[PDB]
Structure formats: C-alpha cells, structure tokens
Design a protein around this ligand. Structure first.
Ligand SMILES: OC[C@H]1O[C@@](CO)(O[C@H]2O[C@H](CO)[C@@H](O)[C@H](O)[C@H]2O)[C@@H](O)[C@@H]1O
Lengths: 447, 447
C-alpha cells in the first residue's frame, strides 16, 4: 500500500467537444472537428459530437457525480466556439455563462476547476483563414485567452493554454487523421510554431488579467521514446523522434529555442523563416507546473506525422494491450517522469491525463465491470509513486476521463471513462473503477 | 451481384440459455450452465444467463423483428430444463407451451421454425448422475426428444438433435472451460461417444413421433484444419486434430464407425470399452441434411484434445474479430468442398456463421456494424462459390439474431444482427440487420 504526498491532487479530465454535445445551441458555431466529423470517412461510423454525453445539459448531475467520487479537482476544456464564435469578435456571454455556472458549482462542491483553453476545437472560420499554419491564429488565440480570463478569472485559478499541441499540429496538418485533415510537412511545422507562439502570448495575457495567485501551465503528451535495439542507428532514431514529439515544444516553451538538431533534421523541408524574431522569447513564459499526458511508450528503429524522420520505423512496444491496441507499460511513465525531473528540475509536474480504453459493457443487472482499467490505473499510479520516491516533483493525477466520450477519429467506439455512458439516453453508470478510484482519492492510499 | 437459388433458406439462430433469461420461472431449474456461471472465475465478470435478453418474456417482439427483416426461418434451441426440470419425469406444460406459442407465432408470420433439442443446457440432475460420460444421459436425451416431438410436431417440421457436441464433450469435460467444467480426457471421450449415441437414439425417436415429411439433422462445428508448414509432421498434426474435432462425430453419425487412426491416437488413454455392441449402428441414422457451423480456420503444427499434446495451435492469418479469431471466408469454401467430397448425398445447411465486433449504440440511437456486413458478405460469397462448384448448400443462418450471453465470455461479445442494451433489454436493429434483410428478400448478394 503506497501513500501519496500531502496535498496530492486527485481528479478526472474531459474535453469540450468530446463530452458537451449541444453543438448548435446557444450561439456556438462549428469548430474544425464539427466539419471533420461530418466529412465522409474521417471519423469512425460517421460519428460526430453533436450530442456526445449531453454534458452541456447534464452538467449539474456530472458535478454531483464528481463529488460522490470525492474528487478534489476537475480538468475540463473551454469551447472557443461557444465563448467567441468564429474565433474573432466579441465574447458571447451566453457561452461563457455555461462555464460560469459549471465553475461555480464545482467550487460549491469543494472541487478545484482546472480549465484548458484549447483542446482542439478551433473555430472553423480560423481554419478557413489558414488555420494553425497561419500566424494570425496565434494572435487570435491570445485574444480569446484574454476574453476567458476576464470572464472566469475570479473563479478559475488554474489555467492550461493548450492540450497536446503535437496532435493538433502533426495529426491535424501532417498525417491529416485529426481535424482539419491537412497533409503537408511544412504546414505541420508552421502549426507547431504558431501553437508555441499562441501559448506564450496566451500566458502573457493570462498573467496580465488573472489574480497574482493564479497558476498557468500547458499540457503536453510527452512521448517516451525507446530504441528497438542497442544499435547506434536506433539511438539516432530515438533522438529524431524525441525532437519531433517533445522538444519541438519543450524547447520553445521551456527553453526559448528550437533544438539545433531538430532544425538540422528538418533542413531539407524548411528554413523556419516563419519563426519571426522575438517569437521564441514570447513562447518562453514562466509556468507554475507542466501538465504531462501519458498512455503508452514509443519504440523506434508527405503524409507522415513525423516531418523529416522518414528513415525511422515504429514498432509495437511489448506488453498487454488496451482497446486502442496500445501497449500497457507503466515503466514508461516512471522513466518519462525521471527524464523530465532531470531536464526541468525546478518545474513541478502534474499528470493531466492517463487512462485506458477497454471494451466495457453494462450487463443485464445494470453493472459495468472494468477490472482491467483498475489494474491499468493502479499500475501507473505505482509508477508515479516510485518516481516521486526517487525525487520527481509530481503534484497531482487526473484520470482521463470521468466519462466515456467521443474519442475523436474513433468516434464513440472507444470507452475511457470511470463512468459509463449509454449514449442513446445519456444515462451515466459509474463503473467498478469509479468506486475503486474514489477510495484512492478519499484515502490518498493505493492498495 | 451473386444470386442464390430462389429456394435457398435465409434465417438467424439463437440458443436457449444464451437469450431466454427467466432462469427460475415457471418451474425451470438449474442447467449445468446455471451452475457453471455461478462458479467464481468460470465466466467473464461473473456474468450469468439469469436475465440475458429477457426473451422468455419478450419473444413476441423478437419474432416481430424477424418478420420485419423478412427472414424465412428461425433456428432456436429448446430448454430441457424448462420442459423436464430433472431430466426425467413429468414434462412441464408451461415449458412446452412457451415453445408451442413461439412456433405458432413464427408460422403466423411465414417464418419456418427450426428447433435444436440440445444446445448445452443439460439439467443439473443428469450431471450429478454422471453427465455425458454416463450412458444413461444418452437414453434420457432420446426420451426427451420424443416429448418435444409429441408437443411440437404439428408445428415444427425441421429438427436438430445436438449443437456442437465437440464443445460439449471436450470443452465441457476435457479442458473444463465450458459447463460442467470437468477435466478428464477419458471423460471427454466417453461424453463424445454418448453424444454420438444420444444423437442416434434421438433421431430414431423423432422419426417415430414426427410426420413423415419432418426433417432431422445434427449441427456440428466442423473445424477446417490447416498445417502451419508443408512438413509431413504438420500434416499428421492436421490429421490428428481433424480426427478429434470432426471425424469423432462424422465417422459414427454419418458412416457408422469411429476412424481407425482416432482409436490408435487415443490408445494410451482408453480402449473404448464403453462403446457397446450395436452402438455404432444406433448412432448412424439417416439425416435429411447436415448442419454446419463455421467461424474461423484452425492452424496447427488441461487440454480439450486428448492424446494430441504433440500438437500446437497458431493464429491463422487475416483480420480478426472481437474474439480475436481470424476472418477467412476461404476456410468456409474449402470446408464445404470437403464435406461435398466426403458426403456427396448429404445436403448441407449453414446453421451458424457470424462474427463478434465491439458494437455500440451512438447518441442518435444507431448501431453501425460495417465490419459485420463485410464478414457476412464475404462468407456468403464463399458459400455461393461452393454452390456453383457443386456443393449442396440449402440454407444459411446468421448466428445470431440478438446480442446474447456468449458462454464463458459472458456479455462481452456481441454477435447479433440486433443490438441489445442489457440493462433495459432494448432491441436496436444494427446496420447489418437492414443489409441482411435485403439479401434474404431477394436472394441477391451485392458484392
Ligand atoms: O525573464 C523572463 C521571465 O519573466 C517573465 C515573468 O515572470 O516574463 C517577462 O518576460 C518575457 C520575456 O521577455 C515577456 O515576454 C513577458 O511579457 C514578461 O512578463 C517569465 O515569463 C519569464 O520566465
């Protein structure tokens, strides 16, 4: 039985388009994912987030559920399309009101609201104007950040600018398997840069409009890259992928510069002239903690999500697999945390996303048993505890996700929730893992 | 497009314990599967068929769906536990009445009732007395056949004695992964013989109590065994498994003799003294057609394969289903060609073919299963080729009309053309249901 540090934060996480629904209600206009999902062949079975879990209408019930589970924090994302339809123009108060009431209720329940400004639902109009590969998008994001802070700054004290920019840039503009579905290596790199720029401009805006005690962060899915063999070549492959997966973001955001090896690796693709003088300084803002997302390790040896790394081959890491077919290896989380502690010793860490998809089902008696999820979470929490014992400054853990939801290109075919959702009715059924996690959250002890 | 013979029969199939529920109503007492499911660790998540799809109560709705889908036949099994609780004594009219009403409803809507006498739900009392390894069970089964024929003979004109005796004998008494859960190679072989015997005695009883035009059959899951390599050693492994999986039943049932190689292969286990004088002639009864069940190929190079410890099994190449089984329609084509070669004068009916996929109902209440449509279409194409090449196949039954209790897998695997939300029992015809209906209506297979 492992005991976690005093004050360790126990929460769950969700994203706006994945759970809200009410896609065309109260002033919300389409995001790139609305467009993408409605495009034949882009999302499994043509699923869309039109309704999803209907959280927009069931929000009060969901907060009550969080309270019953004894969670200390709730990480959610703000829908740019609801707050500032089209990505420009004035704030839409009706949109902000949804988050005002949500945040107020969370606080009334003693649950800390943690808001992510951008979790992929870019207003379609901004993509029409060029999307992330277009510089203006970064400036538009900073204006949106100010709008959000002005409206919710008095109730929300923990802010995250972006969630997994690697996915937005490389899957969104590199391999095109995520909205908006474009496939151009240079567009992907430009997108990555403007996400770095937007992030910095947003933190600047947040610091200026939020109370002095407010916390600001960014959430990155830190790939833990390992080599297939001891070969010197495979070690170079690890470097290349680490550069593209992590350092293209941690470099600018946490060090104020793009890694030189990355620039060299991509020299045949671009000269990075879109990096205007001063952009790196703006991207490099002081953060209160780094949000880390992790699910599985990476093993290595024009339409790719890895511009310039065509020589690299990827392999299935060893271990049992989840419904995503991803390997289950908690050692990757431990090693990843140690790497971060070594590279950024003074930066506190928070696991903002970790969880697993399994083929859950409600039986005739109305129960949803997911012992596999309990095992996955338990094992990964053990790895986190071990990293902490070894010196890593980890301050919290957020289980992706409180609810089964729209898992992007997979549609509703993949269930990650602690709480099962019967989509046709919207009925929530806490799974066995919800009851187990609630105990961990209430005792701070991992059995 | 491929056009099937205008007289080709199109149906769907189910089994009593898998769909009925009402496990303790109207006099029904525990079958070996009720007992097995109640045993910790035997069935996924402790699932049981106590409620299942609640078909015992909602059957009228299911027959209505079949009619809506234009199916020409419905294959179902009779629950011995409902008809004769202890496996002997007075037949319960309430039990018989359920099936009489069901058969009448099917006929009223132009659907041909096809009844299977035994689909694994052996009355517990018969197991307490020895189960299938005990000869009396075969005798009791034949007396049960007469009871069923007397009560339903005026309505049901197509009868099947046993469904997949290989599973009953070897999974039930060999590896113990199926009810009753015993693990004894000799018990498994004795069970196999008594299933062979019971089958024959039942056919005799059916022929005696049914109208002259009634048809009798047996359903066997015929394993299509292939060797990993072209070695003679692998070829012999194929022979050994083919003997244990198929010929241990086809030999006695269709040829009046156990294959000599099987007797040799098992000489270290038994001398088959339980095979009494006259037993082979009894097992060898003329049938109107052979029911064939097929899902995936078998690749070879406590066990359910007595005397075959020198054989290893491998994952056959191809896409996989939720069961992890390889999808290979060529196995069905080849299997049919072999049966046509071995038993040319014996008509064939595909009594079971289908696939499990991780289906879900989306927010709009739809269940899309294009993977199942592809599976069925591909296998039907294989059947059509077999027919064109000379195989006498006269019907096809999609396992299963409904998602149901999939034995040791519990409710974790969905095979239905119709989705079932277990907590409510709500039925939602999947995309495959509408697609299959079109095929069953015109007999035209769109490729
Ligand atoms: O020395 C940079 C250091 O101070 C912070 C405030 O704590 O930000 C200032 O410096 C930036 C870089 O020149 C400006 O872009 C920003 O507006 C300004 O307040 C931190 O972000 C940084 O770590």
């Amino acid at each position: 039985a492992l005991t976690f540090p005093e004050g360790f934060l126990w929460g769950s996480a969700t994203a706006s388009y994945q759970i809200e629904g009410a896609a065309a209600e109260d002033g919300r206009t389409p995001s790139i994912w609305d467009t993408y999902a409605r495009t034949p062949g882009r999302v499994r079975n043509g699923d869309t987030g039109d309704v999803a879990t209907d959280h927009y209408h069931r929000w009060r019930e969901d907060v009550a559920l969080m309270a019953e589970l004894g969670l200390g924090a709730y990480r959610f994302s703000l829908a740019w399309p609801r707050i500032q339809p089209t990505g420009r123009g004035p704030a839409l108060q009706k949109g902000l009101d949804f988050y005002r009431r949500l945040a107020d209720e969370l606080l009334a329940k003693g649950i800390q609201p943690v808001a992510t400004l951008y979790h992929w639902d870019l207003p379609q109009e901004l993509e029409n104007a060029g999307g992330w590969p277009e510089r203006a998008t970064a400036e538009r994001f900073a204006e949106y950040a100010a709008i959000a802070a002005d409206a919710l700054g008095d109730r929300v004290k923990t802010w995250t600018t972006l969630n997994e920019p690697w996915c937005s840039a490389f899957l969104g503009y590199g391999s095109g398997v995520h909205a908006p579905g474009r496939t151009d290596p240079v567009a992907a790199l430009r997108a990555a840069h403007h996400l770095n720029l937007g992030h910095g401009l947003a933190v600047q805006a947040l610091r200026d409009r939020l109370p002095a005690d407010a916390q600001c962060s960014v959430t990155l899915n830190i790939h833990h890259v390992r080599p297939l063999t001891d070969s010197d070549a495979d070690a170079d492959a690890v470097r290349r992928i680490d550069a593209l997966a992590n350092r293209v973001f941690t470099g600018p955001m946490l060090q104020g510069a793009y890694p030189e090896d990355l620039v060299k690796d991509t020299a045949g693709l671009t000269d990075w002239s879109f990096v205007r003088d001063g952009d790196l300084r703006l991207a490099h803002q002081k953060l209160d903690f780094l949000g880390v997302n992790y699910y599985s390790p990476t093993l290595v040896s024009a339409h790719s999500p890895w511009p310039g790394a065509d020589r690299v081959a990827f392999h299935q890491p060893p271990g049992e697999t989840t419904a995503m077919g991803w390997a289950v290896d908690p050692s990757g989380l431990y090693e990843l945390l140690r790497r971060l502690s070594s590279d950024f010793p003074a930066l506190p860490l928070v696991i903002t996303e970790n969880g697993a998809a399994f083929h859950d089902y409600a039986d005739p008696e109305g129960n949803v048993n997911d012992p596999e999820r309990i095992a996955y979470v338990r094992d990964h929490l053990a790895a986190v505890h071990r990293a902490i014992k070894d010196g890593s400054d980890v301050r919290g853990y957020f289980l992706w996700s409180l609810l089964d939801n729209f898992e992007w290109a997979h549609g509703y075919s993949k269930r990650f929730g602690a709480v099962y959702v019967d989509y046709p009715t919207g009925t929530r059924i806490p799974k066995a893992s919800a009851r187990w996690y609630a105990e961990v959250a209430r005792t701070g002890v991992l059995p």
